Amino acid sequence: PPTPHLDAIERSLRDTSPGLEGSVWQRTDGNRLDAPDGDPAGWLLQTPGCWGDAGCKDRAGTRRLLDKMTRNIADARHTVDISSLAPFPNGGFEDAVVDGLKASVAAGHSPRVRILVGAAPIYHLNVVPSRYRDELIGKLGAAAGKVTLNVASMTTSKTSLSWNHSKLLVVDGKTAITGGINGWKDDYLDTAHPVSDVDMALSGPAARSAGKYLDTLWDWTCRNASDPAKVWLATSNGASCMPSMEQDEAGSAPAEPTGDVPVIAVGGLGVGIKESDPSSGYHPDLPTAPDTKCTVGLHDNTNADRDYDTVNPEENALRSLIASARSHVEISQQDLNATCPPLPRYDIRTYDTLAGKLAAGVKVRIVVSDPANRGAVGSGGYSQIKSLDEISDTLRTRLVALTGDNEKASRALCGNLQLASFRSSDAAKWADGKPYALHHKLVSVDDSAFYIGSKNLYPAWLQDFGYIVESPAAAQQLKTELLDPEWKYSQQAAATPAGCP
């Protein structure tokens, strides 16, 4: 069955980073979207999943998420590989890990466990790796002597603002859960104003791809533990740091197919792990478009650095996913624009690809976190814009640059764009008066191909990871479960860009 969206994306990754095929990106067949029996859309792990209700009484999404995480871990025989953005998983996120690990030990296993979080240079960790190690050992009680732990927090570049941001849970290199969800109880669980977010669950060869990606990060992390400014590392009971846990677990038993879903696994190494793919022939025309609102102080890796692309194929994967849309594109993000300075405010090539689609009559929908959510990351900050015009004005600019004339630019912008801030009910905010925070990193195209993972469309130079799936049947579920309901409530917060009918 054909895959015209994946083929275009694959063409662009082999051109961008051929040397990273098999570790930072990889196409595979034979995957399964891992739904529980009698819950066919249950691969889609949305949270809170309480559409239509400003009081959010029944969080069926959250419940399904925590359950799936517990069960995947409960099935572990050898390896459990976790990555996130610091702080370390707490609350129910942490209980899911501890309970799943106790179940695994009770079935007679001795699992190896790696937990990796990235930390911003400015971010003071309350619970450091050794304390988090000891906490887990304590909750594990007697199970503990059977579990080998590597726990690490890491920053790859203080100067270039790079650290881990991927959110992965890989068990035995065969199941994988990823998406936008950090394991932060106050934002997601214990609150009357829960963050809305989505992960997906999968099994199959694409989970081994995720393991390879985590191995790459752990190779760097184990080596750089000689620099405590970069890596804090705690292991259990004399255990070595385990750079290649996933490779060691895969041995060579070519991954078994579990279904019929084709997938591209695609991540990025941010700054400070590898400078380029020396193997790569990539040589793009970079755009040249100053921003009127903001002039960046830092060297701009998003807009103006060839080598950065070659070690961050996810950037091109996303640009060319959007470029492959023939009919419509839906984007659901925290932000399309970044805080400038220190970062560039937007990705020029992404805005151009969008402008190009607008011009060609492709329907584009952008839904972002409500600007009311502006604030510090990790402390309720879920917006980086003051107004939605910051998105529609940039698009106008690029449309004008692209079409030459300001009238055509207006046809395309007013006829083909839906732009709105997110809501999940008829209320404008949560029943407790807090605005809806959106943390999706989702892009869907033509009701066939979609991306879920941890990579934001706004400029950021982090280690990230995600999956692009091509399957009409899956897209249809995504449409029904998430995108249609999102639009039903968010259309009431639709923006009319300046200059439109």
Coordinates of C-alpha atoms in Angstrom, one line a residue:
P1 CA 0.0 0.0 0.0
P2 CA 1.6 3.1 -1.0
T3 CA 3.4 5.8 1.1
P4 CA 3.9 9.0 -0.9
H5 CA 4.3 11.2 2.2
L6 CA 7.0 8.9 3.8
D7 CA 8.8 8.5 0.5
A8 CA 9.2 12.3 0.1
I9 CA 10.4 12.6 3.8
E10 CA 12.8 9.6 3.4
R11 CA 14.3 11.2 0.3
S12 CA 15.0 14.4 2.2
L13 CA 16.6 12.5 5.2
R14 CA 18.9 10.4 3.1
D15 CA 20.0 13.6 1.5
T16 CA 20.4 15.5 4.8
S17 CA 22.0 12.9 7.1
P18 CA 22.8 9.6 5.3
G19 CA 25.4 8.8 7.9
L20 CA 22.9 8.8 10.7
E21 CA 20.5 6.4 9.1
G22 CA 20.0 3.6 11.6
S23 CA 20.8 5.7 14.7
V24 CA 19.2 9.2 14.6
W25 CA 16.6 8.3 11.9
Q26 CA 15.4 5.2 10.3
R27 CA 12.4 4.0 8.2
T28 CA 10.9 0.6 9.1
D29 CA 8.0 -1.5 8.1
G30 CA 6.0 -3.9 10.2
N31 CA 4.9 -1.7 13.2
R32 CA 1.9 -1.9 15.2
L33 CA 0.1 1.0 16.8
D34 CA -0.2 -0.5 20.2
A35 CA -3.9 -0.3 21.2
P36 CA -5.5 -2.4 23.9
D37 CA -7.9 -4.9 22.9
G38 CA -11.5 -3.4 22.7
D39 CA -10.2 0.2 22.6
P40 CA -9.0 0.5 19.0
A41 CA -7.9 4.1 19.3
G42 CA -6.1 3.4 22.5
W43 CA -2.7 3.8 20.9
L44 CA -3.4 7.6 21.0
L45 CA -2.4 8.6 24.5
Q46 CA -4.0 12.1 24.9
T47 CA -4.3 13.8 28.2
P48 CA -6.4 14.8 29.9
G49 CA -9.0 13.7 27.3
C50 CA -12.0 15.4 28.9
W51 CA -13.5 17.2 25.8
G52 CA -16.6 19.3 26.3
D53 CA -16.0 19.7 30.1
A54 CA -14.5 22.8 31.6
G55 CA -14.4 21.1 35.0
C56 CA -12.6 18.0 33.5
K57 CA -14.2 15.5 35.8
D58 CA -13.5 12.4 33.9
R59 CA -9.9 12.2 32.8
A60 CA -10.1 9.0 30.7
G61 CA -7.0 10.1 28.7
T62 CA -4.8 10.5 31.8
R63 CA -6.0 7.2 33.1
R64 CA -5.2 5.3 29.9
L65 CA -1.7 6.9 29.7
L66 CA -0.7 5.9 33.3
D67 CA -2.0 2.4 32.7
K68 CA -0.2 1.9 29.4
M69 CA 3.1 3.2 30.9
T70 CA 2.7 0.8 33.9
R71 CA 1.9 -2.2 31.7
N72 CA 4.7 -1.7 29.2
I73 CA 7.1 -1.5 32.1
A74 CA 5.4 -4.5 33.8
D75 CA 6.1 -6.6 30.7
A76 CA 9.9 -5.7 30.7
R77 CA 12.3 -8.7 30.7
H78 CA 15.6 -6.9 30.2
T79 CA 15.7 -3.2 29.6
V80 CA 13.7 -0.1 30.3
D81 CA 15.0 3.2 28.8
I82 CA 13.5 6.5 29.8
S83 CA 14.2 10.0 28.7
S84 CA 12.6 13.3 29.7
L85 CA 13.0 17.0 30.4
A86 CA 14.1 17.6 34.0
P87 CA 12.7 17.4 36.7
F88 CA 12.8 13.7 37.0
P89 CA 9.4 12.0 36.7
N90 CA 7.3 12.4 39.9
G91 CA 3.8 11.6 41.3
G92 CA 1.9 9.1 39.3
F93 CA 4.5 9.1 36.5
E94 CA 7.0 7.8 39.0
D95 CA 4.4 5.3 40.6
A96 CA 3.8 3.9 37.1
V97 CA 7.6 3.2 36.8
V98 CA 8.0 1.8 40.3
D99 CA 4.9 -0.4 40.0
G100 CA 5.8 -1.6 36.5
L101 CA 9.3 -2.4 37.8
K102 CA 8.0 -4.3 40.8
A103 CA 5.8 -6.4 38.5
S104 CA 8.8 -7.1 36.3
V105 CA 10.9 -8.3 39.2
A106 CA 8.0 -10.4 40.6
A107 CA 7.9 -12.3 37.3
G108 CA 11.5 -13.2 38.0
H109 CA 13.4 -10.6 35.8
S110 CA 16.5 -8.4 36.5
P111 CA 15.9 -5.3 34.4
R112 CA 18.6 -2.8 33.4
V113 CA 17.1 0.8 33.6
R114 CA 18.5 4.1 32.2
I115 CA 16.8 7.3 33.0
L116 CA 18.1 10.5 31.2
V117 CA 16.8 14.0 31.7
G118 CA 18.1 17.2 30.0
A119 CA 18.4 20.3 32.1
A120 CA 18.6 24.0 31.0
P121 CA 21.9 25.6 32.3
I122 CA 19.8 28.0 34.4
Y123 CA 17.6 25.3 35.9
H124 CA 18.3 24.3 39.5
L125 CA 17.4 20.6 40.1
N126 CA 15.8 20.0 43.4
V127 CA 16.2 16.2 43.1
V128 CA 19.7 15.5 41.6
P129 CA 20.4 12.0 40.0
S130 CA 21.8 10.4 43.2
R131 CA 18.8 11.5 45.2
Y132 CA 16.4 10.3 42.5
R133 CA 18.3 7.0 42.4
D134 CA 17.9 6.5 46.2
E135 CA 14.2 7.5 46.1
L136 CA 13.5 4.8 43.5
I137 CA 15.5 2.1 45.4
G138 CA 13.5 3.0 48.5
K139 CA 10.1 2.7 46.8
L140 CA 11.2 -0.5 45.1
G141 CA 11.9 -2.0 48.5
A142 CA 13.0 -5.6 48.0
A143 CA 12.7 -5.5 44.3
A144 CA 15.7 -3.1 44.4
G145 CA 18.4 -5.7 44.5
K146 CA 17.3 -7.0 41.1
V147 CA 17.3 -3.6 39.3
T148 CA 20.4 -2.0 37.8
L149 CA 20.0 1.8 37.5
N150 CA 21.8 4.5 35.5
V151 CA 20.3 7.9 36.3
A152 CA 21.7 11.0 34.7
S153 CA 20.9 14.7 34.1
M154 CA 22.7 16.4 31.2
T155 CA 23.4 19.6 29.4
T156 CA 25.2 19.3 26.1
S157 CA 25.9 23.0 25.5
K158 CA 25.6 25.9 28.0
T159 CA 26.5 28.4 25.3
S160 CA 24.2 27.0 22.6
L161 CA 21.4 26.1 24.9
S162 CA 21.3 22.4 24.2
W163 CA 20.1 19.5 26.4
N164 CA 17.8 16.6 26.2
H165 CA 14.2 17.3 25.5
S166 CA 13.1 13.8 24.1
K167 CA 10.3 12.0 26.0
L168 CA 10.8 8.3 25.4
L169 CA 9.8 5.1 27.2
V170 CA 11.4 2.1 25.5
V171 CA 10.9 -1.4 26.9
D172 CA 13.1 -4.4 25.7
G173 CA 13.8 -2.4 22.4
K174 CA 10.3 -3.5 21.4
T175 CA 7.7 -1.1 22.7
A176 CA 7.9 2.6 22.7
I177 CA 5.8 5.5 24.0
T178 CA 6.8 9.0 23.0
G179 CA 5.3 12.4 22.5
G180 CA 5.1 15.7 24.3
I181 CA 4.4 14.5 27.9
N182 CA 6.9 15.4 30.6
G183 CA 6.5 13.4 33.8
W184 CA 5.4 16.5 35.9
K185 CA 2.5 15.8 38.3
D186 CA 1.6 19.4 38.9
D187 CA 1.1 20.2 35.2
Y188 CA -0.5 17.1 34.1
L189 CA -2.1 15.3 37.0
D190 CA -2.8 17.1 40.2
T191 CA -4.5 20.2 39.0
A192 CA -7.9 21.5 38.0
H193 CA -6.2 23.1 34.9
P194 CA -4.3 20.1 33.3
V195 CA -1.9 20.6 30.4
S196 CA -3.3 19.1 27.2
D197 CA -0.8 16.9 25.5
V198 CA -0.4 13.7 23.4
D199 CA 1.9 10.6 23.3
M200 CA 1.5 7.6 21.1
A201 CA 2.3 3.9 21.8
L202 CA 3.8 1.6 19.3
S203 CA 5.6 -1.8 19.1
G204 CA 7.8 -3.2 16.5
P205 CA 11.0 -2.4 14.7
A206 CA 10.5 1.3 15.2
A207 CA 11.0 0.8 19.0
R208 CA 14.4 -0.5 18.3
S209 CA 15.1 2.7 16.3
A210 CA 14.2 4.6 19.5
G211 CA 16.6 2.5 21.5
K212 CA 19.4 3.2 19.0
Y213 CA 18.7 6.9 19.4
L214 CA 18.9 6.6 23.2
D215 CA 22.2 4.6 22.9
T216 CA 23.7 7.6 21.0
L217 CA 22.7 9.9 23.8
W218 CA 24.1 7.5 26.4
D219 CA 27.4 7.1 24.6
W220 CA 27.9 10.9 24.9
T221 CA 26.5 10.9 28.5
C222 CA 28.8 8.1 29.8
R223 CA 31.8 9.7 28.1
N224 CA 31.0 13.2 29.4
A225 CA 30.5 12.2 33.0
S226 CA 34.2 13.3 33.4
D227 CA 32.8 16.8 33.2
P228 CA 30.3 17.4 36.1
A229 CA 29.4 20.8 34.5
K230 CA 27.8 18.7 31.7
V231 CA 26.7 15.4 33.2
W232 CA 25.6 14.3 36.7
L233 CA 25.5 10.5 36.9
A234 CA 24.3 8.1 39.6
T235 CA 24.4 4.3 39.2
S236 CA 23.2 1.6 41.5
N237 CA 25.7 -0.6 43.4
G238 CA 28.9 -0.2 41.4
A239 CA 27.1 -0.8 38.1
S240 CA 29.0 0.7 35.1
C241 CA 27.6 3.5 33.0
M242 CA 25.8 1.6 30.2
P243 CA 26.4 3.5 26.9
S244 CA 25.1 0.7 24.7
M245 CA 22.3 -1.0 26.6
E246 CA 20.0 -1.1 23.6
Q247 CA 22.5 -2.4 21.1
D248 CA 23.5 -5.1 23.6
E249 CA 19.8 -6.1 24.0
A250 CA 19.1 -6.2 20.2
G251 CA 22.1 -8.7 19.7
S252 CA 21.4 -9.5 16.2
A253 CA 17.9 -10.7 15.8
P254 CA 16.6 -8.4 13.1
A255 CA 13.5 -6.7 14.8
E256 CA 10.3 -8.9 14.5
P257 CA 7.3 -7.3 12.7
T258 CA 4.2 -6.9 14.9
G259 CA 1.8 -5.3 12.3
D260 CA 1.6 -3.5 9.0
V261 CA 2.3 0.2 9.9
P262 CA 5.2 2.0 8.1
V263 CA 7.1 4.5 10.3
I264 CA 9.9 6.9 10.2
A265 CA 11.8 7.4 13.4
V266 CA 13.5 10.7 13.5
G267 CA 15.4 12.6 16.1
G268 CA 18.2 15.2 16.4
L269 CA 21.4 15.6 18.4
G270 CA 21.0 19.4 19.2
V271 CA 24.4 21.1 19.7
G272 CA 27.5 19.6 21.5
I273 CA 27.2 15.9 20.6
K274 CA 28.4 15.7 17.0
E275 CA 29.3 18.6 14.7
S276 CA 28.2 17.2 11.4
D277 CA 27.5 14.1 9.4
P278 CA 31.0 13.9 7.6
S279 CA 29.3 11.5 5.2
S280 CA 26.6 14.0 4.2
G281 CA 26.6 15.6 0.7
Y282 CA 23.9 18.1 1.9
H283 CA 24.4 21.7 0.7
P284 CA 21.2 23.7 0.8
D285 CA 20.4 27.2 -0.2
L286 CA 19.9 28.8 3.2
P287 CA 17.2 31.5 3.4
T288 CA 18.2 35.1 3.8
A289 CA 15.4 37.0 5.5
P290 CA 16.1 39.3 8.4
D291 CA 13.4 39.5 11.1
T292 CA 12.1 43.0 11.7
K293 CA 11.1 42.4 15.3
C294 CA 14.1 40.7 16.7
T295 CA 17.8 40.3 15.8
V296 CA 19.3 37.2 17.4
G297 CA 22.7 37.5 19.3
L298 CA 23.6 33.8 19.1
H299 CA 24.8 31.9 16.0
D300 CA 21.5 30.9 14.4
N301 CA 21.5 27.0 14.0
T302 CA 17.9 26.9 12.8
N303 CA 18.2 29.3 9.9
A304 CA 21.8 29.6 9.1
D305 CA 24.0 26.6 9.8
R306 CA 24.4 23.7 7.4
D307 CA 26.1 21.4 9.7
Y308 CA 23.5 21.6 12.4
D309 CA 20.9 20.3 9.9
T310 CA 23.0 17.2 9.2
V311 CA 23.0 16.2 12.9
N312 CA 19.4 17.3 13.4
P313 CA 17.5 15.6 10.6
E314 CA 14.1 16.1 12.5
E315 CA 14.1 19.7 11.3
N316 CA 14.0 18.7 7.6
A317 CA 11.7 15.7 8.4
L318 CA 9.1 18.2 9.7
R319 CA 9.6 20.7 6.9
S320 CA 9.2 18.1 4.3
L321 CA 6.2 16.5 6.0
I322 CA 4.4 19.8 5.7
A323 CA 5.8 20.2 2.1
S324 CA 4.2 16.8 1.2
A325 CA 0.6 18.0 1.9
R326 CA -1.5 17.8 -1.3
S327 CA -4.8 18.8 0.2
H328 CA -4.6 19.9 3.9
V329 CA -2.4 20.2 6.9
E330 CA -3.3 20.5 10.5
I331 CA -0.8 21.8 13.0
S332 CA -1.4 21.6 16.7
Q333 CA 1.6 23.0 18.8
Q334 CA 2.4 24.9 21.9
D335 CA 4.0 27.6 19.7
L336 CA 5.3 28.2 16.2
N337 CA 7.4 31.1 17.4
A338 CA 10.2 31.2 20.0
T339 CA 11.3 33.7 22.6
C340 CA 13.7 36.1 20.8
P341 CA 16.4 36.7 22.1
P342 CA 18.1 34.4 22.9
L343 CA 16.7 32.3 20.0
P344 CA 15.5 33.2 16.5
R345 CA 11.8 34.0 16.7
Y346 CA 10.8 31.6 13.9
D347 CA 12.0 28.9 11.5
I348 CA 12.1 30.7 8.1
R349 CA 12.0 27.5 6.0
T350 CA 9.0 26.2 7.9
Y351 CA 7.1 29.5 7.4
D352 CA 8.0 29.4 3.7
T353 CA 6.8 25.9 3.2
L354 CA 3.5 27.0 4.9
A355 CA 3.3 30.2 2.8
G356 CA 3.9 28.0 -0.3
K357 CA 1.0 25.7 0.7
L358 CA -1.3 28.6 1.4
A359 CA -0.5 30.0 -2.1
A360 CA -1.1 26.6 -3.8
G361 CA -4.6 26.4 -2.2
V362 CA -3.7 23.7 0.4
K363 CA -5.9 24.2 3.6
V364 CA -3.7 25.0 6.6
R365 CA -4.9 24.9 10.2
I366 CA -2.7 26.1 13.0
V367 CA -3.8 25.7 16.6
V368 CA -1.5 27.0 19.3
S369 CA -1.4 27.5 23.1
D370 CA -3.4 30.5 24.2
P371 CA -1.0 33.6 24.6
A372 CA -2.4 34.1 28.2
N373 CA 0.0 31.2 29.1
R374 CA 3.2 33.3 28.7
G375 CA 5.6 32.5 31.6
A376 CA 8.7 30.5 32.7
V377 CA 9.2 26.9 31.3
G378 CA 8.8 24.3 34.0
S379 CA 6.6 26.9 36.0
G380 CA 3.4 27.1 33.9
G381 CA 4.9 28.8 30.8
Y382 CA 3.1 27.4 27.8
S383 CA 3.2 30.3 25.3
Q384 CA 5.9 32.5 23.7
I385 CA 3.7 35.0 21.9
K386 CA 1.7 38.0 23.0
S387 CA -0.9 37.7 20.2
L388 CA -1.9 35.3 17.4
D389 CA -1.1 38.2 14.9
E390 CA 2.6 37.3 15.6
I391 CA 1.8 34.2 13.5
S392 CA -0.5 35.5 10.8
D393 CA 1.8 38.7 10.2
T394 CA 4.9 36.5 9.7
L395 CA 2.9 34.4 7.2
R396 CA 1.8 37.5 5.3
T397 CA 5.4 38.8 5.1
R398 CA 6.5 35.4 3.7
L399 CA 3.6 35.2 1.3
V400 CA 4.4 38.7 0.0
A401 CA 8.1 37.8 -0.4
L402 CA 6.9 34.6 -2.3
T403 CA 4.1 35.8 -4.5
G404 CA 5.4 39.3 -5.2
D405 CA 2.1 41.0 -4.8
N406 CA 0.2 41.9 -1.7
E407 CA -3.3 41.1 -3.2
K408 CA -2.5 37.4 -4.0
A409 CA -0.9 37.2 -0.5
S410 CA -4.3 38.2 1.0
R411 CA -6.3 35.8 -1.2
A412 CA -4.2 32.9 0.1
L413 CA -4.1 34.0 3.7
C414 CA -7.7 34.8 4.1
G415 CA -9.1 31.9 2.2
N416 CA -6.8 29.0 3.3
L417 CA -5.7 29.6 6.9
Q418 CA -7.5 28.7 10.1
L419 CA -5.6 30.0 13.1
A420 CA -6.8 29.7 16.7
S421 CA -5.8 29.3 20.2
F422 CA -6.6 26.0 21.8
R423 CA -9.8 25.1 23.8
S424 CA -11.3 21.7 24.9
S425 CA -14.7 22.9 25.8
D426 CA -17.3 25.7 25.2
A427 CA -15.8 27.6 28.1
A428 CA -13.0 30.2 27.2
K429 CA -10.9 28.9 30.2
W430 CA -10.8 26.1 32.7
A431 CA -13.7 26.2 35.2
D432 CA -11.0 27.3 37.8
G433 CA -10.1 30.5 35.7
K434 CA -6.7 29.3 34.3
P435 CA -6.4 29.3 30.5
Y436 CA -6.0 26.1 28.6
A437 CA -2.2 25.2 28.1
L438 CA -1.5 23.3 25.0
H439 CA 1.8 21.2 24.7
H440 CA 1.1 19.1 21.5
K441 CA 3.8 18.6 19.0
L442 CA 1.5 17.3 16.3
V443 CA 1.4 17.8 12.5
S444 CA -1.1 15.8 10.3
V445 CA -1.3 15.9 6.6
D446 CA -3.9 14.8 4.1
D447 CA -5.6 12.5 6.7
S448 CA -2.8 10.0 5.9
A449 CA 0.5 10.9 7.6
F450 CA 1.3 12.4 10.9
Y451 CA 4.0 13.3 13.4
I452 CA 3.8 12.8 17.2
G453 CA 6.9 13.3 19.3
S454 CA 8.8 15.8 21.3
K455 CA 10.0 18.2 18.5
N456 CA 8.4 21.6 18.6
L457 CA 8.0 23.6 15.3
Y458 CA 9.4 26.7 17.1
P459 CA 13.2 27.1 17.0
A460 CA 14.9 25.0 19.7
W461 CA 18.3 23.3 19.5
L462 CA 17.7 20.3 21.8
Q463 CA 17.9 16.5 21.5
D464 CA 14.5 15.5 20.4
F465 CA 12.7 12.5 18.9
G466 CA 9.4 11.5 17.4
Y467 CA 7.6 9.3 14.8
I468 CA 6.0 9.9 11.5
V469 CA 3.4 7.3 10.6
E470 CA 1.7 6.9 7.3
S471 CA -1.7 5.2 7.6
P472 CA -5.2 6.4 6.6
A473 CA -6.8 4.1 9.1
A474 CA -4.6 5.7 11.9
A475 CA -5.1 9.2 10.6
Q476 CA -8.8 8.7 10.7
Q477 CA -8.6 7.8 14.4
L478 CA -6.4 10.8 15.1
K479 CA -8.9 13.0 13.2
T480 CA -11.9 11.6 15.2
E481 CA -10.3 11.5 18.6
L482 CA -8.3 14.7 18.7
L483 CA -8.3 16.9 15.6
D484 CA -12.0 17.2 15.0
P485 CA -12.8 17.9 18.7
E486 CA -9.9 20.3 18.9
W487 CA -11.3 22.3 16.1
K488 CA -14.9 22.1 17.3
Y489 CA -14.0 24.1 20.5
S490 CA -11.0 26.1 19.2
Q491 CA -12.9 27.6 16.3
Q492 CA -14.5 29.9 18.8
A493 CA -11.1 31.4 19.4
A494 CA -10.2 31.7 15.7
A495 CA -8.2 34.8 14.6
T496 CA -9.1 36.9 11.6
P497 CA -5.8 38.0 10.3
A498 CA -5.5 41.8 9.5
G499 CA -6.9 42.6 6.0
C500 CA -9.5 39.8 5.7
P501 CA -13.2 39.9 4.6

